[PDB]
Paper text:
Here we present four in situ and one isolated cryoEM structures of the trimeric spike of the cytoplasmic polyhedrosis virus, a member of the non-enveloped Reoviridae family and a virus historically used as a model in the discoveries of RNA transcription and capping. CPV has two functionally essential components located along the icosahedral 5-fold axis: the RNA-dependent RNA polymerase (RdRp) inside and the RNA capping turret outside;25,27 a trimeric spike is attached to the latter.
To determine how CPV releases new transcripts during transcription, we prepared a CPV sample treated with SAM and ATP-containing buffer (SA-CPV), which has been shown to activate the RdRP for mRNA synthesis. Serendipitously, turrets of some adjacent viral particles “kiss” one another in our structure, connecting their open ends and forming a dimer. In this dimer, there is no room for the trimeric spike to attach inside the turret; therefore, we concluded that in these structures, the trimeric spike has thoroughly detached. With these conformational changes, the diameter of the iris increases from 24 Å to 30 Å. The opening of the iris might weaken the interactions between the iris loops and the “cork” of the spike proteins, thus allowing the trimeric spike lodged in the middle of the iris to detach. The detachment of the spike clears the mRNA releasing channel and enables nascent mRNA to reach the methyltransferase (MTase) active sites and finish mRNA capping, allowing the mature mRNA to be released outside the capsid (i.e. into the cytosol). In the turreted subfamily of the Reoviridae, represented by CPV, the turret protein is a multi-functional protein: it serves as the capping enzyme, the signal sensor, and the mRNA releasing channel on the five-fold axis of the capsid. In addition, the structures of the turret vertices before and after trimeric spike detachment illustrate how the virus senses cytosolic SAM and ATP and detaches the trimeric spikes, allowing the release of newly synthesized mRNA.
Author numbering:
A (entry chain A): 379 to 1057
B (entry chain B): 984 to 1057
The structure:
């Protein structure tokens, strides 16, 4: 951000247009994941006892209101931009091309690698012996399996149904059961894949049934004709409403679908196109009328689904004893649909900027793409630090005088910059690069409008957006003390006008570069002793991922975290205008993760939530914290990031959700809530 | 096994005073914890012609302080 060179009224820099044979820009970045991580799912479970009449009418009002006023236009734009078949096609292509060359050996009969191979190729695969693939006969080239967008999702759903009944299974075979896929299935590839996958089994009957089915599937309409009997062990239903109807018609259609599926098999997975609290709870109520049988239901969402899809799957199975808590309220997987309210502004399309300006804030999020003369490269690189924290500079040939530059606009860098009027940079360091210090790369460069970030980065961005909205809503405030802030991570929320203070025992000290940007750093620890707590009358205090750990790198028990919360709450009393924000993992996420298999980085170890290679930390119970803050006597509030925060993060930052990250993001956000302690 | 066996009853478990008091502060009712004292011991031993024993004298001080009464009033 800062340097030893002082700029003033510097002339702007124009980047010339680069040919399409040197720099090419794509829309959505493909994502690379291990083959075993395509088949995941995350559980969500009901947490309510009764469905009273006032709740019924309010939920109906909240649901019908979001039908005519369709889902947010920005979410619709991202959902159809980031598909799933394209988001993982290179992996399947790699598998198929490896298979054809004769490089596929030593995989288990029913492993997920075998299932992926059955989805990647068309021909039948035989085992010359257990745990080895027979080489294909000479002269045989099998065409790659042409599957649609919703095929890998069906494979993951089949895996989930084959995994719920036995959580310790390592193979997925159905001897000698049967299954049917309730789906229109114009040209169903999943039936072919599953038939090719269970061939060694003695006899399993699997087939699709739907409205527009072709051979070998059967063309029927749901509910089934009265003069026919259908019966199977598994149901994987996903029925869509292509035509436009009212709320009542889709209600009746989905009620009939759920009843028929639940009466057709011992286990069923049914897709809900419009998952609302009222709709899901009405489905739950109708489940009880099915002959007085007790049904156990839990919301599900696979890891091979469209990351931005608000559609969630329901799971239905009979249970010996009726579940005490059958109803859902403010669940993780419904709040992606509730909070997807139509926008008050048009979606912002990322753009390419070709002109570099000196301290000019007229830049929308996007990329800096262009080429400049080698002599102006240090100057342009010194002037674009005010917007971007990274830049990839390279040259084509040593006989070429122009230098190609790519850089992404970073809102955190904008927030840290522009806090003052001073313009300093290490322009003296960059002139050491001319002319051969800027790299060479003959090959074409491929950069994406929406790059990839891990799940925790997405969550932090959404929570920062939420806190920034909250802080901007208030008024008459002097500073924002970031207790947990390390390396100025929380600066994305503080307004440029007001101060910002960091109290972290481990942070770099450089007094001049912190004076030049109006920040103050205190490398002393934050003592949670209400007698010595240094809370200004008019300030905002941020506690982000700091309560849950120790500054030396250790984890803290739940009672210590509760004591810290109590200390900050009590010491925050006897103040005029004080606001504090605290975040903590909740105890409801342990129940969901220990039943699921989509855990990639957010994992559970011995009851402590192992998140992103950090030490395993225990969770807190919402009821206990709420009771403690009720007894203390301060105005508390549990707030969680929602869909608009996700959209704003993924739009300002040119980053999009991953295939595996989409399933876990619903649950993760609901169980890392934020406390708003105000006066 | 962590329970109180009194008068050959079925052993029963014990409540924490902090939890009980904390519960009544949220509910919103006036509450108090009352305990019998030495004058109550004298009155029981005078109005009824009874006296303490040897094994009962030592244990009764502990028995009083941990069998309290909650006086909820409006
Ligand atoms: C998602 S589309 C099918 C897309 C593709 N075949 C696939 O594998 O997902 C859902 C299908 O369900 C069928 N469908 C719609 N309403 C139905 C109903 N009421 N009863 C039975 N099938 C229905 C439609 O024909 C439609 O093709
Ligand atoms: C998990 S990081 C959180 C980073 C940042 N707060 C954020 O937005 O996520 C927590 C950091 O806070 C620091 N820290 C731990 N205890 C602290 C305390 N009691 N007071 C101030 N800082 C602390 C630690 O050095 C640790 O690196």
């Amino acid at each position: 951000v800062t340097g030893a060179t002082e700029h003033d009224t510097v002339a702007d820099i124009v980047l010339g247009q680069t040919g399409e044979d040197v720099i090419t820009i794509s829309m959505v970045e493909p994502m690379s994941i291990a083959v075993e991580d395509m088949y995941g799912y995350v559980l969500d479970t009901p947490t309510r006892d009764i469905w009273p009449a006032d709740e019924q009418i309010e939920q109906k009002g909240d649901a019908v209101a979001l039908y005519d006023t369709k889902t947010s236009r920005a979410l619709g734009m991202f959902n159809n931009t980031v598909r799933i078949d394209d988001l993982l096609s290179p992996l399947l292509s790699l598998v198929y091309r490896t298979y054809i060359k004769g490089d596929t050996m030593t995989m288990t009969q029913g492993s997920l690698d075998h299932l992926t191979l059955c989805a990647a190729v068309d021909s039948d695969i035989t085992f010359v012996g257990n745990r080895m693939i027979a080489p294909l006969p000479e002269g045989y080239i099998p065409k790659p399996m042409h599957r649609n967008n919703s095929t890998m999702k069906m494979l993951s759903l089949y895996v989930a149904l084959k995994k719920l009944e036995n959580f310790a299974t390592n193979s997925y075979l159905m001897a000698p059961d049967t299954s049917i896929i309730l789906l229109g299935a114009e040209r169903e590839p999943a039936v072919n894949i599953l038939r090719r996958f269970n061939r060694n089994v003695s006899n399993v009957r699997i087939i699709g049934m739907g409205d527009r089915a072709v051979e070998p599937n059967i063309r029927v309409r749901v509910p089934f004709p009265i003069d026919k009997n259908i019966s199977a062990d598994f149901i994987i239903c996903d029925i869509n409403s292509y035509e436009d109807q009212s709320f009542e018609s889709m209600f009746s259609e989905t009620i009939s679908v759920v009843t028929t599926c639940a009466s057709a098999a011992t286990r069923a997975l049914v897709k809900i196109n419009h998952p609302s609290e009222y709709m899901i709870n009405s489905v739950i109520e109708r489940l009880s009328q099915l002959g007085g049988v007790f049904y156990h239901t839990a919301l599900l969402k696979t890891a091979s689904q469209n990351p931005y899809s608000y559609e969630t799957y329901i799971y239905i199975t009979p249970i010996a004893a009726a579940v005490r808590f059958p109803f859902y309220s403010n669940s993780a997987m419904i709040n992606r649909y509730m909070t997807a309210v139509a926008d008050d502004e048009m979606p912002i399309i990322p753009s390419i900027h070709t002109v570099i300006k000196g301290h000019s804030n007229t830049y929308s999020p996007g990329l800096f793409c262009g080429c400049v003369d080698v002599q102006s490269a240090p100057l342009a690189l010194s002037q674009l630090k005010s917007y971007c924290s990274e830049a990839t500079t390279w040259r084509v040939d040593s006989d070429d005088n122009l230098v190609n530059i790519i850089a992404r606009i970073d809102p955190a860098r904008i927030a840290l910059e522009f806090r003052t009027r001073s313009n300093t940079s290490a322009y003296h360091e960059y002139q050491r690069y001319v002319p051969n210090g800027l790299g060479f790369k003959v090959r074409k460069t491929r950069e994406f409008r929406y790059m990839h970030r891990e799940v925790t980065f997405i969550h932090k961005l959404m929570m920062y957006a939420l806190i920034r909205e909250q802080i901007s809503l208030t008024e008459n405030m002097t500073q924002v003390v970031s207790i947990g802030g390390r390396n100025l991570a929380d600066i994305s929320v503080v307004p440029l006008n007001m101060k910002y203070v960091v109290i972290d025992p481990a942070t770099r000290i450089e007094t001049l570069t912190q004076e030049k940007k109006n920040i103050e750093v205190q490398s002393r620890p934050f003592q949670f002793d209400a007698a010595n707590m240094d809370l200004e009358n008019n300030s905002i205090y941020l506690f982000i991922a700091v309560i849950m750990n120790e500054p030396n790198g250790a984890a803290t028990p739940a009672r210590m975290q509760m004591d810290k919360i109590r200390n900050v709450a009590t010491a925050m009393l006897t103040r005029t205008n004080c606001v504090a924000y605290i975040s903590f993992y909740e105890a409801g996420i342990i129940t969901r993760l220990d039943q699921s298999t989509a855990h990639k980085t957010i994992r559970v170890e011995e009851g402590r939530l192992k998140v992103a290679n950090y030490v395993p930390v225990d969770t807190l119970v919402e009821a206990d914290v709420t009771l403690m803050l009720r007894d203390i006597g301060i105005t508390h509030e549990i707030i969680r990031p929602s869909t608009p925060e996700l959209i704003d993060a993924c739009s300002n930052y040119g980053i999009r959700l991953g295939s595996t990250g989409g399933a876990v993001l619903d649950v993760f956000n609901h169980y890392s809530p934020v406390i708003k302690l105000v006066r």
